[PDB]
Design a binder for this molecule. Structure first.
Ligand SMILES: Nc1nc2c(ncn2[C@@H]2O[C@H](COP(=O)(O)OP(=O)(O)NP(=O)(O)O)[C@@H](O)[C@H]2O)c(=O)[nH]1
Ligand SMILES: [Mg+2]
Lengths: 118, 992, 16, 205
């Protein structure tokens, strides 16, 4: 795979039955373009333990929605994430160190969505 | 869930499987068996079935759980049992342990069960021995000669007994019970020691020897020294048992404790023995373990077998012995090699890569070099030790944990004083090996720079000058020779670190100091990560130490350099982040406060604050017409950054900041009001969720920074009259009503913190202001925090800090509360007692104590009389409740102190009125008699399992001891033990 | 004085 | 290749929060006391293959103690926890240690001082020396800031495997995969999620 984008981030998952955001991991979020399929995915590992907390393709259907409490975060529903086994469905929030990186992330997230439609 | 039914007979086969599902299962089946076993174990009658399990079960874990159920019974209800149950359990446990030692299969493969049985037996000995079991020790010694498994197991019983009596009794039994057991063990130890010493001398079972040595380790905590020095046991420990690795580990720990025995410091025969066992031990180590030249760093890193624990225990043994006894080895010439070999082992131990082990050896090195710095005719012994130590510490210098750094610096400074020349040579050599590349590394050059910077101020000024100049030249040469921005940034940062560490050098060479500063300014434009932060940190660091050379006009200059810094400040800081700009301004504030000509200082302050003041006037102009601009985030950030700049400068200038504070004060408070309106309007338009938005959080940052600025100045002000006359009145009008009338989620806890500072500094001067503070924040904040211990944690902590300082400085404010509000005050204090949160609990207990003292100082007046009538017993009983509920143990000392103050008030007749109702007790009854009756009834209902004799004896001692806190607290601790069991001896309270 | 030492420090450029 | 780990220490010291952080990555802000014990499997990927910890997260409050030292039987390693903002929790470390080694006489044990993220530290580093004579490894940790949060398991893994060069390694990342009858369902929970503010917005991440 090729590294298209790399940014430090904190990934949350929404616990709907508790009305609460739960952290899933902190570490490097990477945009990885497979070279023999050209598909781009999100791969994110926790610092130190290097366990996977995000592993899904940047689907062209996904839309980044802002959270009410943050100008440096995006919220989007994910239908197939395989970070912890079988492809589960999650409502993900991802927060960055600054509004600049969060805006850069949305640009890169949309560029990658164009790549995955071809 | 069948075994929980005590109607039927216990299914032992089902128990063994429920126990197996729990220990070896997983999933929901294990979780269900868990809740079942906890319920079976918690049934108060399960102890009656414990003899079935211990006899019939085939599952060792079931017999363990049975002994646990028994242990609960022996510990808390042993005295309530009929006297024949006590005999049967004791006989059964004694018999079962005898049987287990006879079956070598059981004794070899069921150590957990035998140990658990031995502890259960010890619990029985604590209840029954020796008053109802006087022949235990004689019969224990007799049966030890029968079997080797029994002799070894009796050493396990004696070890555990010594631990329960001497090592773990203080918290778990009363003072009288503990002393009784200590005296009983002490009276019969002579027989215990001879059995123990016979086994050590006669061999030969290693497991029996190890169990005997493990029990000896416990004895050494308390036995008289004659047992160690007037027998042959030191020779055995320091020779025989050091050779075999089975016994080596425990023998080393024993010798460590022997080095801690209380021992007559004048007998020369004992000094010989103390030297002799050390010499034997070091000989066995050199011949049986490893020679003094061995690479212990590599051995430890290999982590074979028990090597790491052994090297840890060796470091503990050497450092413990040498810190106490090295003077024995320093005068005799025949002991010189033994002294230096011991320290050479420590040198080798100090190279191990292990943080916690290094701190242990470093603490000893600190003890040594401090002694070589102060004691005559000593440093010459250790110069080759000290020379090696210099390299060890330089090469392990940590980033300045700062605690470890301060310890390393302290030792390295001592070592530099001891031999400056050797310290220079090592550091320059290390630098040479950075330059030739043999030891080049980012980590290595950084570590060396920290070490070089750490010894600043220990050489003579001229010797330091040539050292510093050499280091700077070499470091500059090292940078020139390196390639790439990554490598060059590392050296430049270290160059700046070193120069920042040598202010005496900078102060004597202005031209060089100015070059440094101008270079730091150059670096404030360097995009490379970390350089700007390093440039700013070095700048303020140098300023703090060399500020005077920035305020005066230096020879060959036309103006003080501070004027040059301010003039170019916009260009210098143009590329810095806001927090870096504030550090820069803070640094300039340090310099300006060095100017004590008031007129010149204020002019420097005006010039420094010129850019934030100009940006301030524009916003005050354009955001007042019209207040739409505050919706723009960019405008909110500019305002926050203007105020933060003012905080930074006020932080370093303190009292001198007042002219600049006056330039903005009135417009700032108006802005505070306007920002408060928009937060309120935004919560009205969008709901409570608005407080989470970036827009509102930015607005609240403005209010928080405004309060922090006012708080910063007032806490440091010298003219308190201006604070009272100019600052306090507009401040209260701006913040109090806005706080009171906002919804809970919109109230800034920083308002309470700001008010705490105001009351702390000028509270004694604004009694009406304190009353207005209480009226605006007391009842509405209390309602926020008095429904649970969780919500609004910041408000909770600041609330009681504010009440605490009001009670200290303006107690009259509480005297003017309506009776209903003063009752909420008492409630709020007791409410603070109940917090597990340490900040709340400590303040709540302190407020209660200061309040009772405030009431005492009033004398015999109606308010003091009514206070005691309404709240004395509330405070007595609320204090007892947290004392005895086992969930506020962190506040024991201050609970004990408050209670002693409450009790002593009555037994000193400092309460004039009677505390009772005139009908409920005969007239003329003293408060003392009524207090003991109230407390007796209270404790009888709160702890119904106590006898009336217990309660009476406890209270009799407690009231008689209310002038002796150490004794008073011991009596409380005895009460806290007796309420956990049934049948506590009431005579225990006669201990003192 | 250390005028030569100050000249080296002033020259220092981590970008060369 | 699984090992039994008993986690002991006073109530409120953060034993359960520490484990949850390792299990799911979350930080539980609420204190919900453990009743008896909660067993969780915990797997780490190392250069020596996966290592599995069966974490017996025991209860620190005495009224919830359950089987107490019964949980320690056949433990192969242990973590003793205390709170650097609560001196009583460090004062009790010798009590937890005494009960533990009476059952497990020769297991590797990590002593952890939790909650170092809090400014007002009460148990100072200079005061923490109990591990020395007992040969326990010590770490400052914070389950909230994740400071050193992997060190206790890394050190234990090295002791249990017998390899001092053991390291955690990145688990391999297989490719992720790629209906309208659930479009209105996911849109409903998305809208609730956007109206729930993310926690700890003042944090750096
Ligand atoms: N600031 C901070 N709080 C922490 C940290 N770790 C845990 N806590 C908090 O401390 C409280 C105790 O949580 P918990 O993990 O259940 O402690 P426990 O030792 O398992 N309790 P028990 O022994 O009764 O089961 C929680 O509110 C948690 O948020 C930490 O690292 N930092
Ligand atoms: Mg818990």
């Amino acid at each position: 795979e090729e590294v298209l984008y790399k940014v430090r981030a904190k990934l949350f998952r929404f616990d709907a039955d508790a009305k609460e955001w739960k952290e899933r991991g902190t570490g490097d979020c990477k945009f990885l373009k497979n070279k023999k399929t050209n598909k781009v995915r999100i791969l994110m590992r926790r610092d130190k333990t290097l366990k996977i907390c995000a592993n899904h393709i940047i689907a062209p259907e996904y839309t980044l929605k802002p959270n009410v409490g943050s100008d440096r975060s995006w919220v989007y529903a994910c239908t197939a994430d395989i970070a912890e086994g079988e492809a589960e469905a999650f409502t993900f929030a991802i927060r960055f160190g600054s509004k600049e990186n969060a805006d850069k992330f949305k640009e890169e997230f949309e560029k990658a969505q164009e790549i995955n439609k071809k | 869930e069948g075994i929980l039914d005590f109607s039927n007979d216990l299914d032992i086969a089902l128990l063994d499987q429920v126990v197996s599902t729990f220990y070896q299962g997983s999933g929901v089946q294990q979780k269900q068996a868990q809740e079942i076993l906890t319920k079976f174990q918690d049934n108060p009658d399960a102890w009656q079935k414990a003899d079935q399990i211990l006899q019939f079960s085939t599952n060792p874990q079931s017999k363990f759980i049975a002994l646990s159920i028994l242990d609960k019974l022996i510990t808390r209800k042993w005295k309530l049992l009929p006297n024949d149950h006590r005999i049967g359990i004791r006989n059964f446990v004694v018999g079962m342990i005898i049987s287990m030692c006879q079956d070598d299969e059981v004794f070899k493969t069921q150590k957990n069960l035998i140990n658990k049985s031995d502890l259960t037996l010890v619990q029985i000995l604590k209840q029954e021995w020796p008053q109802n079991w006087p022949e235990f020790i004689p019969e224990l010694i007799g049966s030890s000669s029968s079997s080797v498994n029994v002799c070894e197991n009796n050493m396990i019983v004696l070890k555990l007994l010594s631990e329960e009596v001497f090592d773990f009794s203080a918290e778990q039994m009363t003072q009288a019970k503990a002393l009784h057991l200590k005296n009983s063990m002490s009276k019969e130890f002579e027989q215990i020691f001879k059995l123990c010493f016979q086994v050590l001398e006669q061999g030969s079972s290693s497991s029996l020897i190890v169990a005997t040595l493990e029990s000896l380790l416990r004895y050494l905590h308390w036995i008289p020294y004659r047992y160690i020095y007037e027998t042959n046991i030191l020779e055995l420990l320091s020779t025989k048992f050091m050779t075999s690795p089975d016994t080596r580990a425990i023998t080393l720990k024993c010798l460590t404790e022997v080095s801690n025995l209380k021992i007559p410091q004048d007998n020369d025969l004992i000094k010989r023995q103390t030297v002799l066992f050390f010499q034997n031990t070091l000989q066995q180590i050199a011949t049986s373990v490893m020679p003094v030249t061995a690479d212990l760093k590599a051995t430890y890193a290999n982590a074979n077998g028990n090597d790491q624990s052994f090297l840890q225990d060796l470091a503990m043994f050497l450092t413990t012995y040498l810190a106490r006894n090295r003077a024995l080895l320093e005068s005799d010439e025949s002991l010189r090699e033994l002294l230096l070999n011991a320290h050479q082992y420590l040198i080798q131990l100090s190279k191990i890569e292990e943080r916690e082990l290094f701190k242990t050896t470093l603490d000893y090195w600190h003890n040594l070099v401090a002694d070589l710095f102060y004691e005559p005719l000593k440093k010459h012994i250790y110069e080759e030790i000290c020379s090696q130590l210099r390299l060890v510490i330089i090469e392990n210098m940590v980033r300045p944990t700062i605690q470890l750094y301060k310890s390393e610096r302290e030792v390295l400074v001592y070592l530099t004083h001891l031999n400056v020349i050797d310290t220079e040579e090592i550091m320059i050599s290390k630098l040479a090996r950075q330059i030739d590349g043999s030891e080049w590394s980012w980590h290595n050059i950084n570590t060396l720079s920290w070490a070089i910077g750490s010894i600043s101020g220990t050489m003579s000024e001229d010797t330091e000058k040539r050292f510093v100049v050499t280091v700077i030249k070499d470091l500059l040469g090292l940078c020139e020779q390196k390639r790439g921005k990554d490598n060059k940034a590392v050296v430049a940062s270290d160059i700046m670190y070193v120069v920042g560490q040598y202010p005496r050098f900078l102060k004597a060479h202005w031209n060089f100091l100015r070059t440094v500063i101008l270079k730091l300014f150059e670096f404030m434009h360097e995009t490379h990560e970390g350089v700007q932060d390093m440039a700013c940190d070095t700048f303020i660091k140098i300023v703090q130490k060399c500020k005077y050379h920035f305020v005066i006009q230096q020879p060959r200059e036309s103006e003080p350099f501070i004027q040059t810094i301010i003039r170019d400040i916009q260009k210098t800081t143009a590329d810095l982040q806001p927090q870096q700009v504030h550090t820069f301004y803070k640094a300039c504030g340090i310099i300006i406060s060095e100017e004590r000509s008031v007129a010149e200082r204020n002019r420097l302050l005006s010039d420094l604050m010129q850019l934030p003041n100009m940006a301030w006037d524009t916003i005050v102009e354009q955001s007042t017409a019209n207040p739409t601009l505050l919706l723009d985030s960019e405008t909110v950030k500019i305002i926050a950054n203007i105020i933060k700049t003012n905080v930074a400068v006020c932080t370093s200038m303190g009292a001198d900041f007042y002219p600049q504070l006056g330039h903005i004060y009135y417009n700032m408070l108006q802005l505070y009001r306007a920002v408060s309106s928009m937060i309120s309007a935004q919560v009205a338009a969008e709901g409570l969720i608005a407080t989470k938005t970036p827009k509102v959080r930015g607005l609240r940052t403005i209010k928080k920074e405004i309060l922090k600025l006012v708080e910063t100045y007032i806490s440091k002000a010298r003219n308190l009259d201006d604070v009272v006359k100019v600052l306090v009145e507009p401040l209260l009008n701006a913040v109090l009503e806005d706080y009171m009338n906002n919804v809970p989620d919109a109230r800034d806890a920083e308002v309470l913190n700001c008010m705490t500072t105001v009351v702390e500094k000028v509270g004694h001067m604004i009694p009406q202001g304190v009353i207005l503070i209480l009226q605006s924040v007391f009842e509405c904040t209390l309602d926020m925090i008095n429904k649970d211990f969780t919500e609004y944690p910041e408000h909770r902590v600041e609330f009681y800090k504010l009440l605490k300082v009001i009670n200290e400085k303006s107690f009259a404010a509480f005297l003017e509360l309506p009776p209903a509000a003063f009752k909420l005050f008492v409630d709020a204090i007791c409410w603070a007692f109940k917090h597990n949160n340490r900040d709340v609990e400590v303040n709540g207990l302190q407020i209660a104590l200061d309040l009772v003292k405030n009431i005492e100082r009033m004398g015999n007046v109606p308010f003091a009389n009514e206070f005691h009538k309404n709240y004395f017993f509330i405070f007595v009983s609320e204090t007892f409740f947290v004392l005895t509920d086992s969930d506020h143990k962190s506040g024991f000392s201050k609970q004990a102190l408050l209670l002693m103050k409450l009790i002593s008030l009555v037994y000193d007749n400092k309460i004039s009125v009677p505390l009772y109702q005139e009908a409920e007790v005969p007239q003329g009854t003293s408060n003392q008699v009524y207090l003991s009756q109230y407390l007796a009834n209270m404790l009888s209902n709160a702890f119904p399992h106590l006898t009336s004799e217990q309660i009476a004896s406890f209270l009799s001692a407690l009231t008689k001891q209310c002038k002796d806190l150490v004794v008073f607290k011991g009596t409380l601790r005895d009460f806290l033990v007796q309420i956990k069991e049934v049948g506590g001896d009431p005579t225990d309270y006669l201990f003192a | 004085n250390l005028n030569e030492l100050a000249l080296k420090l002033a020259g220092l450029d981590i970008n060369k | 290749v699984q090992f039994k780990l008993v986690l002991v220490g006073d109530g409120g010291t953060g034993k359960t929060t520490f484990v949850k952080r390792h299990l799911t990555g979350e930080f539980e802000k609420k204190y919900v006391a453990t009743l008896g014990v909660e067993v969780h499997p915990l797997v780490f990927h190392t250069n020596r293959g996966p290592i599995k910890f069966n974490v017996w997260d025991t209860a620190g409050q005495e009224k919830f103690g359950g089987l107490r030292d019964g949980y320690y039987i056949q433990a192969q390693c242990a973590i003793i926890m205390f709170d650097v903002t609560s001196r009583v929790t460090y004062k009790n470390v010798p009590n937890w240690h005494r009960d533990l080694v009476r059952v497990c006489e020769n297991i590797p044990i990590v002593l952890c001082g939790n909650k170092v993220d809090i400014k007002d530290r009460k148990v100072k580093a200079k005061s923490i020396v109990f591990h020395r004579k007992k040969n326990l490894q010590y770490y400052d940790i914070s389950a909230k800031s994740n400071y050193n949060f992997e060190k206790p398991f890394l050190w234990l893994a090295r002791k249990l495997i017998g390899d001092p060069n053991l390291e955690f390694v990145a688990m391999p990342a297989l490719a992720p995969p790629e209906d309208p009858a659930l479009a209105a369902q996911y849109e409903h929970d998305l809208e609730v999620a956007q109206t729930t503010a993310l926690p700890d917005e003042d944090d750096d991440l």
